[model samples]
Target: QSRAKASFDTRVAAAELALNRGVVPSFANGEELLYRNPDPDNTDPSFIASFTKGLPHDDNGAIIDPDDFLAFVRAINSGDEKEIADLTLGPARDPETGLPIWRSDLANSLELEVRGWENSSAGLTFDLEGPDAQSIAMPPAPVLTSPELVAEIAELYLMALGREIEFSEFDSPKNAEYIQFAIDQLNGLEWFNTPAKLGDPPAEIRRRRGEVTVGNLFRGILPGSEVGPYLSQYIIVGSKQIGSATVGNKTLVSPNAADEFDGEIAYGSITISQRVRIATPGRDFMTDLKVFLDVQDAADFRGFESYEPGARLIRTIRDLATWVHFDALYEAYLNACLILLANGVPFDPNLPFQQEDKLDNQDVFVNFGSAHVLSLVTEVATRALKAVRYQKFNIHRRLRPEATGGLISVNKIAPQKGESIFPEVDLAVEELGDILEKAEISNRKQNIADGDPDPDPSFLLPMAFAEGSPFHPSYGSGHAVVAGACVTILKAFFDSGIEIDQVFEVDKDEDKLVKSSFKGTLTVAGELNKLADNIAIGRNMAGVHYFSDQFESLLLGEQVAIGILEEQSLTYGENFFFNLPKFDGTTIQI
Candidate 1:
């Protein structure tokens, strides 16, 4: 038992070293250790007393300053007998026999208590608008593959559970169990299996490619069927191993570990090759999804270049390195909101689900809730981040293939990867805006988004149901105005230089289409005008979006959209990027 005491001291000391370096100061104080064996009844009280003898006591007769004891334990872990001898009077003696216990066996028993370990990237930031995070009562149990991984997880759990940190907005939805999933992956890394002595490859980076998936990267690749035909693009990202180090980290690594994500994206496009015209009142995903894809892939006709015999199978891959940089910040913003909402989502159980119990009222508890808002933002941000991350190699991958380009073919309209990692949230906002416009028009005639409340009587005149007519509902559909808010942000991203009038253009032939030579880096008034038809068509495609819903959603979207130009202007670095139009209330130019 004396030997076990010495070994226990050694392990505790190492934990203390980690505490000194990384444990926040706040959580470092007031911690206590209640040491005990598996069966207190079978343990000798005299030995226990001797083991804890001379430990400084608090007013409550409890050992105080466990940190010092832990520090002493860390010293023992270094395999120095002198360190242990300095802390204890040889092996713990059996008071009855006045004899020493085997020190080696005791040390072995102390080591067995540990089952698993892991490490965390960084603590999460709290968002102010959501519910408080509760302590996760249960987390997935972990098993360590190597000593290094075990040590890493042990320290990370300390950070999370040691009460060293406090957040104003709790991450309600994120339980310790969920975080354990991540830790499990970290613990499973082969890098932890072998301790590299000198000039070792950064195995951690290699492991990241195989494991550290962010924003649904692996999901799209593995399931190439099903959603493949409907995907706009899919991306598969690979990483290059670079050296890492620990500067202020508890774990030893190079100190230059910067906040960067190394990964890739695969791009593909999928949608019904043809448009589906349905009599069903629109927004039905099952019916519409079926309709769109059926029309889009008609195989009977083929055309050459100006008129291809078949659809062009051309593909493009671009470097996504730069895009990944922006995502570090974008994801930070998204996480803040998501954490807030997920925590906040559970019913408070104190408030009513509805507002003012009355007739003719509407308010979406789920959609408008704080958590809901954050969820949508996170979803959009993730899409954008993945879009750019994998985009880096898009053009190259498409034009060239390893050994055989014929075998690795690109489809015309399938998502390059899986889901459009990024929907150009700004662009989607614009599309939603058009839908809202139509919703408003329909609503004014008592044609609420779902359907008409009452059918026209056989005796009623056709002119009776026409909007702005004498017998029409005495109101204007406000759908367009509300929906415009969402899509407006999308337009800002793709065609900021286009004018509102240009968005309304209706040219049927590209050869006859007029071009405006506005001399500027950006202008997009024209794109706004072109949106007119899109809005009309989108509203009719019910399953896709509601004109009124989109308009309202736009207003909702605008709250979060930031000006890319503003971001660009603030930075001084030079790098090639997709040149998009800028909006300045003038002629649309790019």
Candidate 2:
């Protein structure tokens, strides 16, 4: 008789305790830190604590939106799940997937973990397994006017400046004066080095550790194993079907052009690289934060939802500021893993791929191996995004890089009649000042000798896309957090440690991946990490997010994936452990 229903509740309680080890995640900033902003003075200059930038101006140029500078704290500060759900309903929906494009899962994004294997844990929420979305908090973002903020904006400047520079050229002398200046300025920041110390240096992220000079230019906390080429092998070399053929290598993606544009005196001299990745930067920006409440407080589009723009109708991936296009928050990783499984890469040794002599008796095919990986990788995305939304709306409520740029520009020139303020403020101006001056000099000089109007320069960050950042705040990056979860799933399910020494790079003229003669070791783990960095920092490249937005988000998403896996691990009958290579380069077994 099937009589285990009532009595099986005994072990269900034990299963929840086993996975959580009985503890909730430490609250973000312990829910108490001085990151929120009114920006009273230097002592109050914590960076990204508020959302006040790139808003509508009156006929005379004044703020047409926002009652409070910290927009998240305004109309929706109550933290009511039901209110947020109703308010953040639907900004827009994708024609292809029919899923809402903005705040994709802000409505009722919580889960209850229950399984009926050894026992049934119903309506039971463990610390990790099926944890409440709001329960998983993001740390109070990089506080006001700190070096961490300094580095984020500074690095964004470099990304905007170098949009056309191929990854191959990051190590070279093309921007000799510019590169050295940035490196010097970044290193000069007080208490700054890399992520361990709170700044993300140039090469410490996932890029080929090119010339030794590159490392100092960038900073990160990724371990030695995670550092490698700027683009992931997953991105450049993957199998995909085109026309009548299933190509085994080379992605036909085009690279955005750099340093080649007709000068626009406003919004900086730079123009979007429309021919390659996206169409052209739209001439519009989202109106304001009140504009959203001036409705659902809300890639391919970013912004709070309201009197929305009529669509740039271009691409998204708010990586850097100047370049625009491709929505990053959903389904990108599905394509990544589908191609990953088809290739000869090995599955993690912890789980048996089976299907050989054992293919006759049993299979890890349907439920355990490829399908499981693909399903979970894609599945975790929505909930992971839901978690990040809580942080974006409830916890951090940080500013976009676009917003930061305006603030930085104001600080740069705001004081001229007395430089308006402090020595620390002056220091920031000088740093951002150097970036502005460098970008300005290069642009005006471009074709100026041949007769070009000097492009008017402003301290505002040169945006990669016309729309600037998405309307959302720039902390707990949804794209990176999802990358964190999906990529971790890929690591546990696939053999991330497998060596991939084959090298490839883009032929910009052809805009296709071509085999390179360079010899170096590249592995799935490193490249996977690069994949995470690619989309996450890709936003920064577009002038949307910051170092903290993507990197810290990478950890939160990993935490999300790890807990889900622990919950899944409990339900399985196979006596096999799972191997996970976390973003921080730490490996653990389940």
Candidate 3:
């Protein structure tokens, strides 16, 4: 607490300094921030405004700003009560709902965002990325029939009940009542049993706050000494490893020397190097991972000296691998594949389904494309769920290399030591220290710590880059596996050699959108593969996984995808062959 106290004070002070510097705090706009504002220009009385329009102004028409804002912030910070009534006054109406916004309540909510930006973006260029990275178009959800709907229902059930629906449970007469209840609950057939919305559902339906469910028991959430059996599995017990059926030699190598192994791993007489292809024409998976990490770090911190998290120009940058993990990617690729198939590009003769017969000579890319794509998406989603399950069960209990027994820069060990831990950070070691100190302080005050139970007592801090790693083991990287599986499936359907020149514009608080383009000629396979690596290594940079965790997980995910594809292929109504890349440098026909 003493060490953390110093850090918190530094952060609070930094927040104060930013306010003192005349920078006004503002929200970067998005669907979440979007509101219907009163307008008289036309019949539509709504206009998009970037930040909160209710910010107080002075007699001179100058923005009262963060300096004034921080006064209210400090009052809340120190538990003050005097003259806080005005701040507490509420029932402000939003244009769309015409309902009160709850004056103090809404301000506090906005303040939370402001403070998060102050702490995380302080002395940094904060980009809006991931999830709401951009305004993307999405098809409406189906009312029935599609398997994705079923899978979504299943996911909600998993979250609510904390267990998988067994095959036997689906067929048993005794379980018939339960199945009906589930259907009733899911479909809102019963009174007051409304459908759950996406994102975080009702707390009653969610796993207990801070309680580890069967799904995430590997994360080992707790106040102290709560490391799970799965996470503890990473702590080499004598010569054996938990969560693994076989005992393999430790292939741990230094960061600088990690390249010698490339994507190969050897166990006893078995060498995996021969099975995997780690490089393509323009990219080396290993080197590309490194380059991506370095570039992302630099790009994230761009304009940092001139930036602060609470500054008016709150920026957002998209994660490199966001697309590959999306269901949209599956839908898009499926349509593209169906287009090729419909145009007489033959499905492998081995595949069971005849395109002309099954597809009925319909242009799947146009007519009823949404429905057709939904069907494939459901299949892909199921496969992904299995891959995710496999990862959780098989790769449980390994501490991220950055967490322990690996990199120390992002780790708690010697956090106050020096800048060399996070190489290429342009800020001085002291400045970086200030940033971290501020983050830890803010986190602690908010009762937010990254990993549970503090892996090491003295080093009970989250990684410097991310808010915190996901609550899961680090062995089989989620992003890598998803990438491997999704990219593999995409390769089975689409043109792997297709080029991309897509451009994205991110809105800044300054009213000027930042334009950037992904201009390189990228194969669907190459780009998706690279994107997966980017996400995997991005996690590494975020201080979540060891390099080996990501590298090996890619192969693990690839294996899962192949298995799913093979199984799905069998059900295609005809024998079909998929030509896919193996982690080892070879292609196999399944």
Candidate 4:
């Protein structure tokens, strides 16, 4: 028993050391020793008095003796297994001896408690007693196999992708397959089982392929099959609502349904009537650009290109990002507003974008309440974050084995000794380097011609636009899906025909700053929808996404946002109404 105590204490110190160095010592079921009550409190007067020669108590009658270590030793060596179980499982004492019971041999009496353990790159939980259990389940020495560690990491990655595993399905065959895939990929690596080297291989960068999801099925059914027949039947009576137009072999277009989304202009292509040129160095201009770029892009583009002689800005009417920082386009608009404001331009009051409730200026800016505005923004942001996380889960994994010339392969950058890890992905590191070098030279020449002193041409080519995206799959565009969700939300609440009033100033080389303001009417809806387009296309411009990825992801984002909005509306208890705009510019309250 004394030897057990010494061993336990020694291992505890070692575990503490590993934890201090960012290594978590894991454990299997029932391997760790725990106590329902630790020392310094609840001295268990009756048990302490019996374990040692009766030590003196404090004046308040609190036992001054610390006998837990000896009590644990006795509990383990006792004749009764209940005494051992009592100490190991829960609180208990022997009626005959008054000594602490550390174990129980009774049926179901060895109640080992387990709770959610957040270990490794993933979290796997075991069912145990209820939440109120007081027993401390100490983590045992880290003893998981390489495959187990791999599975744990996969579970964590899947969780980030919004994939949940049922508690019962923790040991499911599919789960094991996921674990095996990870192991096979990482088997030969030197750091395969090393706790401290867990993050070195970039497992999170593996790309997760999406399924033929519910959203895809719904969109497909809406234009055909049973839903399409009724939709077509209804359109015959009211061409305004539905028209008998068959698009391609599969699309049964109800004109009314088509018109619901009709007249939507491409705001990204909206003409900028004026230009604002700032006389700044390249680096300063790039630094200022961070405020407008997507979070991922901003992070990657940082420190890549450092010099810019001047920043050319296109002036448009209403700034969406400034008035409504809902998505990337809107964020960029805010950046534009910031630039203009910094130049002493006064902004017009955007009372229209404010919440319906009457409040102070700060509240008005902060609270964008209602079914569409605030809810839309919340859902969009939430979904955006989730998508990024999801995308990260499957990074570095190629789009498909059948596909050719996809994003750069994993071995391209992180080379391994053997034949390429993913031979299917043929993007060689040497080839990529040559292409990148050529792009830089071409961009540098162009920049020098445009009066740049020291040209950083890295930003010229849209390669690895969102930084880590090169290592991730390119199946779905994060910007597009998030944009779609936000755009739909904006479309629900506001009038598209809102007037635009914005001015931008550029300092000429002659030392005088000239102001250019657009006096045109820009539809709020148009700009908002256009904002999504701009954001989506921006990714394309950055070379991280294919056009199909941008297009298909928008629908997914729209569905996600719509579902979130519907769920949120249930909490309101009222049928939330919005004046929905239709084709040919008519409004109907829905």
Error of 2 at 538 (Å): 0.5
What C-alpha lDDT does candidate 1 achieve relative to the native structure?
0.22
RMSD of each: 32.5, 12.0, 26.0, 26.0
lDDT string for model 1 (350-464, tens) is: 1223243353163434533444333443433322222111111110011001000001111101143442211212222222232223222332233222243552211100010
Model 1 clash tally, residue pairs: 137
lDDT of 3 by residue, 1-590 (tens): 69588666655554443234342222111211122212234332111111111223221111134233334334323332453333422123457754333222222233211111111111121211111101111112111122222222222222112112221123236545545544443333211134334663232122122322332221211111121111110010111111222225655333322211121222222322211111111110111111112211111221111112221110111121112222242432333333233222333333334345446453334222333323543355334434333333221333232222112123332344532232211122222233334333433432222222322222122232222234344544566555555555555444444443322122222322233232334333444454444445444433445434454555545554555555444333333466664544366675
Worst 10 residues of 3 by lDDT: 231-240
TM-score quality measure for candidate 2: 0.69
Higher lDDT: candidate 2 or 3? 2
lDDT values, one for every candidate: 0.22, 0.51, 0.30, 0.30
The sequence of per-residue lDDT tens digits that candidate 4 reaches over residues 498-534 is 4333221222222222322324344444444444544
Candidate 3 local Cα displacement, residue 436, angstroms = 12
Tell me how candidate 3 scores on lDDT.
Answer: 0.30
What TM-score number comes out for model 1?
Answer: 0.18
Best by the lDDT measure: 2
Runs in model 3 lying further than 4 Å from the true structure: 1-362, 365-396, 405-467, 501-520, 574-576, 579-585
TM-score of each: 0.18, 0.69, 0.33, 0.33
**Which stretches of model 2 miss by more than 4 angstroms?**
1-48, 53-129, 173-177, 191-212, 215-220, 224-226, 240-276, 279-325, 328-330, 353-355, 358-360, 417-426, 439-457
